[PDB]
């Protein structure tokens, strides 16, 4: 059948970490000190609020399952869980937040090199998930986090499944392949569609796709053959890559491995593929922080 999943689920003591502040509302920014290791690891802590919903607890542990099973530089993984009244997911702190929020906040200071490198990094993440026969089903700029402006990771495995037929929920219509909206079919190729929309969000500095169009309309518009428009900064080269991600024949869309290749070629000469005003000028980056270690340098056998 399939290869056994020997990934380790690490159970942490609540005393091993301190919650430093609140990020969203519930996610906290904290520090994790592994028991007798003398390192401090900046962490994001996702703690279930209600904790009285058994349905809810089956949703966060599915996420923990997936995040524990992934190890790639462009995919966020799970450091461990804490089994207090409330289940807490402990993950690498991604200090600069979601790429969606970051392109909105910094539109004026983001050059072609960064945008195309992000497209490459997200293509590697998605290629790695595909190697692991994993379909994300919620790729969007909101679900890509920024460790540094040089370094992004795909997150939110809330809807991730393996290799897919589903039956309801509140769904991201505007990011979904046609076969997904109509027939609840999802493949690596449906993920490529959503990659397409994710790239469009970055190239429009975080514009809402099909802004002010009702979700009930979306399925019809796409059958009528309409797609999101060419963003201003986008050479036809870059936009043609987005448009191929939105072909009706799922096998006619590019493979993540090909998206890596194409965007790498373009990242080698960024000003030839994205036209941005003032591109050349663009510039971006407790008590004892001595024993701080980013999760990426904190490895376990
Ligand atoms: C790389 C693991 C990860 O996903 N960390 C993470 C998660 C979240 N969530 C789930 C909201 N984060 N929010 C912020 C601001 C950082 C952050 N990091």
From Swiss-Prot:
Effect on the protein upon substituting residue 162 to Q: Found in a lung cancer sample; constitutively activated kinase with higher levels of basal autophosphorylation; more sensitive to gefitinib than wild-type
Covalent cross-link (Glycyl lysine isopeptide (Lys-Gly) (interchain with G-Cter in ubiquitin)), residues: 21, 38, 55, 58, 224, 255, 265
Summary of the function given for this chain in its UniProt record: Receptor tyrosine kinase binding ligands of the EGF family and activating several signaling cascades to convert extracellular cues into appropriate cellular responses. Known ligands include EGF, TGFA/TGF-alpha, AREG, epigen/EPGN, BTC/betacellulin, epiregulin/EREG and HBEGF/heparin-binding EGF. Ligand binding triggers receptor homo- and/or heterodimerization and autophosphorylation on key cytoplasmic residues. The phosphorylated receptor recruits adapter proteins like GRB2 which in turn activates complex downstream signaling cascades. Isoform 2 may act as an antagonist of EGF action.
Family assignment from sequence similarity: Belongs to the protein kinase superfamily. Tyr protein kinase family. EGF receptor subfamily.
Record note on modification: Phosphorylated on Tyr residues in response to EGF. Dephosphorylation by PTPRJ prevents endocytosis and stabilizes the receptor at the plasma membrane. Dephosphorylated by PTPN1 and PTPN2.
Involvement in disease: Lung cancer: A common malignancy affecting tissues of the lung. The most common form of lung cancer is non-small cell lung cancer (NSCLC) that can be divided into 3 major histologic subtypes: squamous cell carcinoma, adenocarcinoma, and large cell lung cancer. NSCLC is often diagnosed at an advanced stage and has a poor prognosis.
Gene transcribed to yield this protein: EGFR
Entry's Gene Ontology cellular component terms: basal plasma membrane; basolateral plasma membrane; cell junction; cell surface; ciliary basal body; cilium; clathrin-coated endocytic vesicle membrane; cytoplasm
Binding residues for ATP: 46, 91-92, 156
Positions of modified residues (N6-(2-hydroxyisobutyryl)lysine): 46
Result, substituting residue 10 to A: Abolishes phosphorylation
Effect of residue 24 to C: Found in a lung cancer sample
Residue ranges occupied by any Protein kinase domain in the UniProt entry: 17-274
This protein's UniProt keywords: ATP-binding, Cell membrane, Developmental protein, Disease variant, Disulfide bond, Endoplasmic reticulum, Endosome, Glycoprotein, Golgi apparatus, Host cell receptor for virus entry, Host-virus interaction, Hydroxylation, Isopeptide bond, Kinase, Lipoprotein, Membrane, Methylation, Nucleotide-binding, Nucleus, Palmitate, Phosphoprotein, Proto-oncogene, Receptor, Repeat, Secreted, Signal, Transferase, Transmembrane, Transmembrane helix, Tyrosine-protein kinase, Ubl conjugation
Active site: 138 (proton acceptor)
Site feature Important for interaction with PIK3C2B, where: 298
Outcome reported for the amino acid change (mutating residue 272 to A): Reduced phosphorylation
Molecular function terms from GO: actin filament binding; ATP binding; ATPase binding; cadherin binding; chromatin binding; double-stranded DNA binding; enzyme binding; epidermal growth factor binding
Source species of the chain: Homo sapiens (Human)
Tissue localization of expression: Ubiquitously expressed. Isoform 2 is also expressed in ovarian cancers.
Protein name listed in UniProt: Epidermal growth factor receptor
Outcome recorded upon mutating residue 69 to I: Found in a lung cancer sample; constitutively activated kinase with higher levels of basal autophosphorylation; more sensitive to gefitinib than wild-type
Cellular localization per UniProt: Cell membrane; Endoplasmic reticulum membrane; Golgi apparatus membrane; Nucleus membrane
Oligomeric form and interacting partners: Binding of the ligand triggers homo- and/or heterodimerization of the receptor triggering its autophosphorylation. Heterodimer with ERBB2. Forms a complex with CCDC88A/GIV (via SH2-like regions) and GNAI3 which leads to enhanced EGFR signaling and triggering of cell migration; binding to CCDC88A requires autophosphorylation of the EGFR C-terminal region, and ligand stimulation is required for recruitment of GNAI3 to the complex. Interacts with ERRFI1; inhibits dimerization of the kinase domain and autophosphorylation. Part of a complex with ERBB2 and either PIK3C2A or PIK3C2B.
In-chain residues carrying the UniProt-annotated modification Phosphotyrosine: 164, 298
Effect of residue 49 to P: Found in a lung cancer sample
GO BP term (any one): negative regulation of apoptotic process
């Amino acid at each position: 059948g399939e290869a056994p999943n020997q990934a380790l689920l690490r159970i942490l003591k609540e005393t091993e970490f301190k919650k430093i502040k609140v990020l969203g509302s519930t996610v906290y920014k904290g520090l994790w000190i592994p028991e007798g290791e003398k390192v401090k690891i900046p962490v994001a802590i996702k703690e279930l609020r209600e904790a009285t919903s058994p349905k809810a607890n089956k949703e966060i542990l599915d996420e923990a399952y997936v995040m524990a099973s992934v190890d790639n530089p462009h995919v966020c993984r799970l450091l461990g869980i804490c089994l207090t009244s409330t289940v807490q997911l402990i993950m690498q702190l991604m200090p600069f937040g979601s790429l969606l929020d970051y392109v909105r906040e910094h539109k004026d200071n983001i050059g072609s090199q960064y945008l195309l490198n992000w497209c490459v990094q997200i293509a590697k993440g998605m290629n790695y998930l595909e190697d692991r026969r994993l379909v994300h089903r919620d790729l969007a700029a909101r679900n890509v986090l920024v460790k540094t402006p040089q370094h992004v990771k795909i997150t939110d495995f809330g809807r991730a499944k393996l290799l897919y037929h589903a039956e309801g929920g509140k769904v991201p219509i505007k990011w979904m392949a046609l076969e997904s909206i109509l027939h609840r079919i999802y493949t690596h190729q449906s993920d490529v569609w959503s990659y397409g929309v994710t790239v469009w969000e970055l190239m429009t500095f975080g514009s809402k796709p099909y802004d002010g169009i009702p979700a009930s309309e979306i399925s019809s518009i796409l059958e009528k053959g309409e797609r999101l428009p060419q963003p201003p900064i986008c050479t036809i080269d870059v936009y043609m890559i987005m448009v191929k991600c939105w072909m009706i024949d799922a096998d006619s869309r590019p493979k993540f491995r090909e998206l890596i290749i194409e965007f790498s070629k373009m990242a080698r000469d960024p000003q030839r593929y994205l036209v941005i005003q003032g591109d050349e000028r663009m510039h971006l980056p407790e008590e004892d922080m001595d024993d701080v270690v980013d999760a990426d340098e904190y490895l376990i056998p």
